[PDB]
Enzyme design. Sequence first.
Site, short mmCIF file in Angstrom:
data_model
loop_
_atom_site.label_atom_id
_atom_site.label_comp_id
_atom_site.label_asym_id
_atom_site.label_seq_id
_atom_site.Cartn_x
_atom_site.Cartn_y
_atom_site.Cartn_z
N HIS B 216 1.13 -1.53 0.31
CA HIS B 216 -0.10 -0.18 -0.07
C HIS B 216 0.47 1.03 -0.16
O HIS B 216 0.22 2.49 -0.02
CB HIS B 216 -0.64 -0.24 0.98
CG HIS B 216 -1.54 1.34 0.96
ND1 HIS B 216 -2.23 1.67 0.22
CD2 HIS B 216 -2.92 1.21 2.21
CE1 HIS B 216 -3.64 2.42 0.53
NE2 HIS B 216 -3.71 2.54 1.84
C1 CAO Z 1 -15.23 9.90 -3.34
C2 CAO Z 1 -15.60 8.62 -3.28
C3 CAO Z 1 -15.08 8.46 -2.43
C4 CAO Z 1 -16.71 7.91 -3.16
O1 CAO Z 1 -17.50 8.23 -4.31
P1 CAO Z 1 -19.64 7.64 -3.90
O2 CAO Z 1 -19.98 9.28 -4.05
O3 CAO Z 1 -20.17 6.13 -3.63
O4 CAO Z 1 -20.15 7.54 -6.07
P2 CAO Z 1 -19.21 7.90 -7.46
O5 CAO Z 1 -17.33 8.28 -7.13
O6 CAO Z 1 -19.34 9.73 -7.35
O7 CAO Z 1 -19.19 7.26 -8.35
C5 CAO Z 1 -20.97 6.68 -8.33
C6 CAO Z 1 -21.19 6.02 -8.60
O8 CAO Z 1 -21.21 4.47 -8.39
C7 CAO Z 1 -22.17 3.76 -7.91
N1 CAO Z 1 -21.32 3.10 -6.36
C8 CAO Z 1 -20.88 3.73 -5.72
N2 CAO Z 1 -20.85 2.96 -4.22
C9 CAO Z 1 -21.40 2.02 -4.89
C10 CAO Z 1 -21.31 0.56 -4.34
N3 CAO Z 1 -21.04 0.34 -3.54
N4 CAO Z 1 -21.97 -0.64 -4.76
C11 CAO Z 1 -22.59 -0.24 -6.01
N5 CAO Z 1 -22.36 1.13 -6.86
C12 CAO Z 1 -22.19 1.88 -5.99
C13 CAO Z 1 -22.86 4.66 -7.29
O9 CAO Z 1 -24.19 4.95 -7.07
C14 CAO Z 1 -23.25 6.09 -8.64
O10 CAO Z 1 -24.26 5.40 -9.18
P3 CAO Z 1 -24.68 6.68 -10.81
O11 CAO Z 1 -23.06 6.28 -11.36
O12 CAO Z 1 -25.24 5.66 -11.18
O13 CAO Z 1 -24.95 7.85 -9.81
C15 CAO Z 1 -15.18 7.93 -4.47
O14 CAO Z 1 -15.07 8.40 -5.44
C16 CAO Z 1 -13.06 7.77 -3.42
O15 CAO Z 1 -12.14 8.52 -4.23
N6 CAO Z 1 -12.93 7.10 -3.09
C17 CAO Z 1 -11.60 6.22 -3.04
C18 CAO Z 1 -10.79 5.09 -1.95
C19 CAO Z 1 -9.84 4.72 -1.56
O16 CAO Z 1 -8.98 4.79 -3.00
N7 CAO Z 1 -9.17 4.04 -1.13
C20 CAO Z 1 -7.86 3.49 -1.22
C21 CAO Z 1 -7.23 2.81 0.41
S1 CAO Z 1 -7.91 1.10 0.59
O17 CAO Z 1 -7.03 1.06 2.09
#
Ligand code: CAO
Lengths: 243, 243, 243
Positions: B216
Amino acid sequence: IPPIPPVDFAKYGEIEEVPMTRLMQIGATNLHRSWLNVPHVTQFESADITELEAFRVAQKAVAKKAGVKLTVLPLLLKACAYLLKELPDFNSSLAPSGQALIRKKYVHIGFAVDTPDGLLVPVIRNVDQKSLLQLAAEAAELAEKARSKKLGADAMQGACFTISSLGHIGGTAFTPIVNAPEVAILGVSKASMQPVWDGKAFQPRLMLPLSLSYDHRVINGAAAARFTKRLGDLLADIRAILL
Amino acid sequence: IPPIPPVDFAKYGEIEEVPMTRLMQIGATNLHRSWLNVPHVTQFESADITELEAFRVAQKAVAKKAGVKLTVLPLLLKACAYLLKELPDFNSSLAPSGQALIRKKYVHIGFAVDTPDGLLVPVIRNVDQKSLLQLAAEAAELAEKARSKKLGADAMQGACFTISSLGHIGGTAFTPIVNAPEVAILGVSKASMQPVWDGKAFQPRLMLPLSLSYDHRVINGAAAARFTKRLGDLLADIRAILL
Amino acid sequence: IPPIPPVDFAKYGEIEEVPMTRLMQIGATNLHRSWLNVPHVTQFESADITELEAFRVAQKAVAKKAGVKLTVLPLLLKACAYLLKELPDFNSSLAPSGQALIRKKYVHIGFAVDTPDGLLVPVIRNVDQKSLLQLAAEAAELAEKARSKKLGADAMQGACFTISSLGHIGGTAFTPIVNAPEVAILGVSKASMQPVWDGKAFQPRLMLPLSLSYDHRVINGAAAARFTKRLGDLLADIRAILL
Ligand SMILES: CC(C)(COP(=O)(O)OP(=O)(O)OC[C@H]1O[C@@H](n2cnc3c(N)ncnc32)[C@H](O)[C@@H]1OP(=O)(O)O)[C@@H](O)C(=O)NCCC(=O)NCCSO
Ligand SMILES: CC(C)(COP(=O)(O)OP(=O)(O)OC[C@H]1O[C@@H](n2cnc3c(N)ncnc32)[C@H](O)[C@@H]1OP(=O)(O)O)[C@@H](O)C(=O)NCCC(=O)NCCSO
Ligand SMILES: CC(C)(COP(=O)(O)OP(=O)(O)OC[C@H]1O[C@@H](n2cnc3c(N)ncnc32)[C@H](O)[C@@H]1OP(=O)(O)O)[C@@H](O)C(=O)NCCC(=O)NCCSO
């Protein structure tokens, strides 16, 4: 190891300090010691306990007559004892020279009990020699002593392997920490009805989730994939233990 | 790191000391070194290999004519080589300054072989340049040399990524340990028939369990969820590698 | 801890050195510090979000009128805030004496955002007091500031728990690393249609994969199997939060 920097947590809101029991502390120290010494791998598997369950439930009468309650734990304990004898590497510990294994010719097995003050792991001695209702009764006695803080150190020593069971609560799988100087620990999660393909169609079978964590210095991955596989087979037909 | 206190194991029963091979010891030391240096995460995924399997099995004739046996491993090796070039971060190592990555422009891939004396990981060089039957043949040659203790150190060096395959034994998933200074390792478990929803009803598809463990510090979670996702797509249609 | 021996990687082919951003480096150091201090366990579970999803999707109009997009993250955040108050041990940190817990009476929750330069975890304060569209809007604002490198340190402090969401990419489960001095982190993977047995036949339910990693010195396994279980229940009927 670097420490974690102290944070004034009260900057963000109201805090309250509550203290840890000495059991927590003991527990905390031991897990940290195991975490840093053992390169951990977890091997996950599912066993078909459809028939094992129907047996357990049909022997409820005999069990009530003997005063014991027969859950899946005496059945896990018998099967693991048998296997700990078929695969002795799982029944052993790394000698302090780091250049040998000490193979134990005995099978005593610990099981995790959850008490208000912290975790205790009583040990059943010579699991390989007791029957399902003996193990059922002893398991229950040791757990009530554990909960009553009336369990004495004599009974928490000399274990070869630990079973940690959360099936009574829920969960799909987890990755337990090896209790060094033991070399493996079986975690057991909640059984679910699941579709299992028969060659032609999916059949509902009652599946038990198993998580075996192990000390990779001593156990390599194929040996552990083989341990979980044999255990999955023994639980699918526990009569194979008669052979 | 605190050591584990010595226990007189012979208090509890009969013990026997058996010694570790030098391979075990080497292996033990390396895993401990990786465990303490790499903050490990595992990302799990399942790939639909229903069509990949029917291809593998139909090319059995060609394979028999070439003397090779084509299993899923040459197919995994091709797909990962392609991906290691699309996502170069997975093909790299953390420089000793701790402030840079050394991107490798080559793709050599190791695979874990299980031998009586311990684990060996021979390396196939320039996986990205060989075909399915070349990789099939070389994989087999290196594994027989490994098992015969006739594998020489030249062939266990300079790997960029490791595939650890237990599909031949069983298991649902596991969490492999990264072979530092590599940054990721794919674990592969046994393929099962499973119901997969099509929008209207569940269809039996043959699902391959993938477990990608990664360093990581170098790889964040979304990049790794993206790696397993692309691999799941490449294995569902390996013709995409032609594009 | 032993270091990993340096390898001349250029013996095997062409290499290129690319450097890490200061965010990577910061990130790398923090994860290594957490990895060595926290004995980690991961508890996996699946929640039936069939009805939660139909609610989310039907409120799309209201959401569009408010300018927010409502995904599953504000729903996770509300449910975890409620639970962090029902199970306060999850809302706390191990005091530096190692003999006490500092229970936080506040609920601020961080969430992982993935940016080109590395990972950032903005914090929403007093999650327990905001509604689904407030959390929806703030989540979105903090993520765009994070991505624009316009997020300021004020907003990355004082978190009690972190949600790490890869559901938007794929994956079945993963094992996140606890952000010390927090004690737990929920990982969320992609929701799938799955057969769930009703007593008589399998029904397609839309299942959300949850991976809760926790600091086992502070949290024992049954408490964590209980946390994921309650969360699975709250997500199956979010009206229980009204009670
Ligand atoms: C900002 C965020 C935290 C959260 O995003 P979010 O608000 O859930 O959704 P998004 O990025 O806008 O994507 C949304 C689409 O995917 C879908 N989606 C999100 N979670 C989902 C889930 N768990 N299951 C299925 N589909 C999902 C949404 O419902 C949405 O659907 P639509 O496009 O039809 O509206 C994410 O974009 C992110 O950057 N995650 C990174 C986490 C990470 O990198 N972890 C690493 C460290 S590991 O120890
Ligand atoms: C004492 C014990 C070890 C074992 O309990 P047990 O004997 O299996 O069952 P129990 O607690 O009496 O609960 C029994 C009920 O749940 C059921 N159950 C138990 N295991 C089950 C399983 N794996 N799947 C489904 N249901 C299960 C039993 O069959 C029983 O059914 P009935 O109520 O119909 O008879 C457990 O109570 C315990 O405290 N576990 C704690 C383990 C732990 O905390 N680990 C943490 C460290 S994590 O590294
Ligand atoms: C040499 C090898 C790497 C790879 O073997 P392989 O080429 O895939 O197959 P094999 O051993 O010949 O067994 C092949 C049979 O099992 C099948 N099999 C292989 N992978 C499978 C999979 N993932 N799912 C289902 N079945 C599989 C093959 O397709 C083949 O079928 P047939 O017998 O019908 O032809 C393996 O034998 C080995 O030793 N693995 C050890 C890995 C390990 O020990 N890891 C431990 C460290 S854990 O961090």
